[PDB]
Amino acid sequence: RRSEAITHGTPFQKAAALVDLAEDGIGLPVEILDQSSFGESARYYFIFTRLDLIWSLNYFALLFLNFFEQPLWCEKNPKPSCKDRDYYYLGELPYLTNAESIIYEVITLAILLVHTFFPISYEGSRIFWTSRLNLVKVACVVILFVDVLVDFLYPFRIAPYVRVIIFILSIRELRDTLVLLSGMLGTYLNILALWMLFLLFASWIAFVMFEDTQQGLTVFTSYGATLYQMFILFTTSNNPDVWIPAYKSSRWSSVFFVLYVLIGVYFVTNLILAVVYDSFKEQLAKQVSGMDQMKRRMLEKAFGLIDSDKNGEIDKNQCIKLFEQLTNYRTFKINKDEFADLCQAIALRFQKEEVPSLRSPNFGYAISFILIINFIAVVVETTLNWQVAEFVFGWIYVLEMALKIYTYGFENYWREGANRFDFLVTWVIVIGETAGEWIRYLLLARMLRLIRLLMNVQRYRAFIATFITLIPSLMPYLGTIFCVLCIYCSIGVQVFGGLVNAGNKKLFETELAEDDYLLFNFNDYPNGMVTLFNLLVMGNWQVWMESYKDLTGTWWSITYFVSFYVITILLLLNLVVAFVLEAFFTELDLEEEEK
């Protein structure tokens, strides 16, 4: 898919290059594809995309800055200071000084300005300024510039939110996931309406049924208290604890709570999952259609490069001239659609990639035997039934890397999803030879490759193959969940920071103190992230909700936890379930086509 062919080649080379780009799934921007003299514009797009590692590193740096900033409650002079990390149950990451924060922010903003305005080199000015994505990015960069300036000048801070928005906007798969999700929201709010109606009605029955009982006197003291407890019971997290007083008062009370939990989980929760799954399928189909339209647009541009006369036809003397530039550089008359069908058929049957310029099958057996020997060595070493053996295996693994990159070349080697990981962990190993036991886990991280041999076992092939394909293909969804946690974390540290401290005295009544959860707090960004992970797992989750309700003295604090549950569990994790199921069924159909 050579940039040089697109930039400089004769039209037949440009056509073959656009074809290989399209069927490798890479679209040139329409702002380039729609113009005649596109080569000089494309020149800049390729130098832009050559720098993707620099831009990606800048975005991950900008996002990770949130983990190293001092909490705002520490700036407003607490007694004692946040140097007393044990008094405030804080984490172990350093807090950047003002000087360090200024340096970090200035550097990352300068690279962000370059990345955001450089597209005006290949898009034109009017084309640039009319893109909605560019306008939103310019708004984000100007907000970060003003936020930098207004503290280089030296009740809340905006920057951490804008950094997460910039990160979302800078990864195509995350933008795509949010566009997909925006199509699901309309149908999601309907079933939330029915779920609320269910909770309200079940809570009304429960309230009027227990009003003068011990359950009434001690748990269901009001309709709001009932609705709160019944909401937590929908999650099952407070079962059976919430209805023990009823069961002590009468064993028949268990029938009500049995019916409630049975209906709430096995009917209502599964139907919410089903609604989310159907909507996800509809939006994914719409996305794949859009990608097919991109592919067709590129193939039509290729035909518009070969046809310079606009008669809409190419002859066999042109067609063989394209067929060479395809079948030996990347792998009757024809018309605009016939070309697209013929080429996608070539992409089906004949298409196997040629190797770039500049290995035996049993070599895989040799390295598999070596890494199983290494595994049995590691086990007999841990049970204490050798640094020179760990050295000689590390040497063999770097020798394998060097041999494979020599025989195939890195531009061919690095294409495989496996060997790029083997390369990464081998590099981390050899740079670990800085002269502990941590190399044990790196070599076993290589040993994990042995699990691919279970794809030879037909009863396991589908499972292992789906797990392997899921590792990369879930990253957009897991990353969207991660960005949602980052926003909720910044809110939590803004609204709850400093309340969990060793002098609070109310804290030691709060259940957070009784369950020993005091390190899972919102005093710091990493603390908030691990707390939000515990919330996402739903294990004991209402402990934090009830404790921060006590510590803040307001029921409005529960809006945080309720909204977090409604967004992340009932929607995003159900989306993950749907995605895993659809991936597995796709694998079974692929095997049913292989056989």
Interface residues with a second copy (CB under 8 A) are 91-93, 187, 190-191, 194, 205, 208-209, 236-241, 244, 247-248, 250-252, 254, 258, 261-262, 265-267, 270-271, 273-275, 277-278, 382, 440-441, 444, 459-460, 463, 466-467, 470, 474, 478, 515-517, 519-520, 526, 530, 533-534, 537-540, 573, 576-577, 580-581, 584-585, 588
**Range 437-441, long-range pairs (CB < 8 A, 24+ positions):** 439/390, 439/394, 440/378, 440/382, 440/390
In the 8-state DSSP scheme, what is residue 455?
G
Site for Ca ion in 153-172 (CB under 5 A): 157, 159
Task: Rank residues 52 and 516 by Cβ distance to Na ion and give the closer one.
Answer: 516
Q: Could you say which of Ca ion, a second copy, Na ion, none residue 275 binds, taking C-beta under 5 to 8 angstroms by partner kind?
A: a second copy
- In the complex, least distance from residue 78 CB atom to a second copy, rounded to whole angstroms: 21
Provide the sign of the torsion angle of the four alpha carbons 398, 401, 405, 410, taken in this order. Answer: negative
For 38, phi then psi, to 5°, come to -70, -15
- In the complex, least distance from residue 385 CB atom to Ca ion, rounded to whole angstroms: 17
- In the complex, least distance from residue 534 CB atom to a second copy, rounded to whole angstroms: 5
- In the complex, least distance from residue 254 CB atom to a second copy, rounded to whole angstroms: 5
- In the complex, least distance from residue 271 CB atom to a second copy, rounded to whole angstroms: 6
Q: Could you say which of Na ion, a second copy, Ca ion, none residue 157 binds, taking C-beta under 5 to 8 angstroms by partner kind?
A: Ca ion
Q: Could you say which of Na ion, Ca ion, a second copy, none residue 356 binds, taking C-beta under 5 to 8 angstroms by partner kind?
A: none
Task: Rank residues 283 and 540 by Cβ distance to Na ion and give the closer one.
Answer: 540
For residue 336, give the nearest of 299, 361, 309 by alpha carbon.
299
Give 314's strand partners. 334
The residue type at 567: I
Residues contacting Na ion: total by CB under 5 A = 1
- In the complex, least distance from residue 90 CB atom to a second copy, rounded to whole angstroms: 10
SS3 471: helix
- In the complex, least distance from residue 551 CB atom to a second copy, rounded to whole angstroms: 19
- DSSP for 62-108, written as a single string: HHHGGGTSPPHHHHS--SS-TT-TTTTT--SSPPPPHHHHHHHHHHH
Cα–Cα distance for residue pair 278/203, rounded to 1 Å: 29
Site for Ca ion in 202-221 (CB under 5 A): 211
Task: Rank residues 84 and 211 by Cβ distance to Ca ion and give the closer one.
Answer: 211
Cα–Cα distance for residue pair 407/104, rounded to 1 Å: 42
Q: Could you say which of Ca ion, Na ion, a second copy, none residue 517 binds, taking C-beta under 5 to 8 angstroms by partner kind?
A: a second copy
Task: Rank residues 237 and 331 by Cβ distance to a second copy and give the closer one.
Answer: 237
Paired tokens of 173: 């798969």
Task: Rank residues 381 and 550 by Cβ distance to Na ion and give the closer one.
Answer: 550
- What separation, in Å, do the N-terminal and C-terminal C-alpha atoms of the chain show? 33
- Decide: 31 and 122 in contact? Cβ < 8 Å: yes
- In the complex, least distance from residue 147 CB atom to Ca ion, rounded to whole angstroms: 5
Cα–Cα distance for residue pair 298/41, rounded to 1 Å: 16
For residue 594, give the nearest of 443, 461, 495 by alpha carbon.
461
Task: Rank residues 121 and 540 by Cβ distance to Na ion and give the closer one.
Answer: 540
Q: Could you say which of a second copy, Ca ion, Na ion, none residue 109 binds, taking C-beta under 5 to 8 angstroms by partner kind?
A: none
- In the complex, least distance from residue 48 CB atom to Ca ion, rounded to whole angstroms: 29
- In the complex, least distance from residue 213 CB atom to Ca ion, rounded to whole angstroms: 7
Contact partners, residue 522, CB within 8 Å, separation at least 6? 489, 492, 493, 495, 496, 497, 499, 500, 528, 531, 548
336 lies in the site for Ca ion, by CB under 5 A: no
CA-based Rg of the chain, rounded to a whole angstrom?
30
Q: Could you say which of Ca ion, Na ion, a second copy, none residue 171 binds, taking C-beta under 5 to 8 angstroms by partner kind?
A: none
Beta carbons within 10 angstroms of residue 338's beta carbon: 14
Q: Could you say which of Ca ion, a second copy, Na ion, none residue 463 binds, taking C-beta under 5 to 8 angstroms by partner kind?
A: a second copy
Q: Could you say which of Na ion, a second copy, Ca ion, none residue 175 binds, taking C-beta under 5 to 8 angstroms by partner kind?
A: none
Residues contacting Ca ion: total by CB under 5 A = 3
CB contact burial 66-90 (16+ within 10 A = b; e otherwise): bbebbbebbeeebeeebeeeeebbb
For residue 205, give the nearest of 244, 256, 136 by alpha carbon.
256
Q: Could you say which of Ca ion, Na ion, a second copy, none residue 170 binds, taking C-beta under 5 to 8 angstroms by partner kind?
A: none
Paired tokens of 50: 């050559």
Taking residues 520 to 559 in sequence order and writing x for each that binds Na ion by CB under 5 A, - otherwise, the string is --------------------x-------------------
Task: Rank residues 214 and 540 by Cβ distance to Na ion and give the closer one.
Answer: 540
Task: Rank residues 167 and 195 by Cβ distance to a second copy and give the closer one.
Answer: 195
Cα–Cα distance for residue pair 546/593, rounded to 1 Å: 53
Q: Could you say which of Ca ion, Na ion, a second copy, none residue 159 binds, taking C-beta under 5 to 8 angstroms by partner kind?
A: Ca ion
- Alpha helices, DSSP H only, in 334-474? 336-348, 363-382, 387-408, 410-413, 417-432, 439-447, 458-473
- In the complex, least distance from residue 65 CB atom to a second copy, rounded to whole angstroms: 19
Task: Rank residues 516 and 594 by Cβ distance to a second copy and give the closer one.
Answer: 516
Q: Could you say which of Na ion, a second copy, Ca ion, none residue 570 binds, taking C-beta under 5 to 8 angstroms by partner kind?
A: none
- In the complex, least distance from residue 486 CB atom to a second copy, rounded to whole angstroms: 15
For 314, phi then psi, to 5°, come to -130, 145
- In the complex, least distance from residue 436 CB atom to Ca ion, rounded to whole angstroms: 9
Task: Rank residues 207 and 303 by Cβ distance to a second copy and give the closer one.
Answer: 207
Give 334's strand partners. 314
- Decide: 227 and 203 in contact? Cβ < 8 Å: yes
Give contact residues for Na ion (rule: CB under 5 A). Answer: 540
Q: Which residues bind Ca ion (CB under 5 A)?
A: 157, 159, 211
